[PDB]
Amino acid sequence: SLTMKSQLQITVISAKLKENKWFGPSPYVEVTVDGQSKKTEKCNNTNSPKWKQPLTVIVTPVSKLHFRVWSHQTLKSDVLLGTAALDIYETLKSNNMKLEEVVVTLQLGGDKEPTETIGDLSICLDGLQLE
Numbered sequence: 001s002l003t004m005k006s007q008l009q010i011t012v013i014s015a016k017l018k019e020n021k022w023f024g025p026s027p028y029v030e031v032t033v034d035g036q037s038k039k040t041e042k043c044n045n046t047n048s049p050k051w052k053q054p055l056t057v058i059v060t061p062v063s064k065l066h067f068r069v070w071s072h073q074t075l076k077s078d079v080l081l082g083t084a085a086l087d088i089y090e091t092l093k094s095n096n097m098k099l100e101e102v103v104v105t106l107q108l109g110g111d112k113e114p115t116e117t118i119g120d121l122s123i124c125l126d127g128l129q130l131e
């Protein structure tokens with residue numbers, strides 16, 4: 001029951017990234033959960049990326065979703081801009097135990113400094129219920 005899986009759709013909607021003082025980042029989002037990793041495509045040179053991109057992951061009612069916002073680079077590692085996490089069980093609680101097009105915004109915490117908010121990330125969850 002807490003072990004039954006669902007192929008959850010997560011639409012990664014958009015993010016607002018605090019400006020860094022010339023050209024902006026070229027961000028995409030990676031979702032990781034339960035052995036899996038799914039990445040959106042990138043937006044180029046923007047602190048207000050709008051992906052509106054649906055991804056799926058196979059989760060249980062107690063899975064914990066982890067988000068990373070990366071900036072793409074050709075010639076070295078992509079840069080980790082910030083991270084967030086969302087407990088699917090808490091999300092279910094907040095929405096009568098059924099995730100039907102639930103929009104959630106999360107604060108993104110900095111890589112080098114976890115305590116610093118570097119932006120926020122909006123997603124929409126659909127296709128999971130408990131009971």
Ligand SMILES: [Cl-]
Pocket residue numbers: 085086087090091
């Ligand atoms: Cl949470």
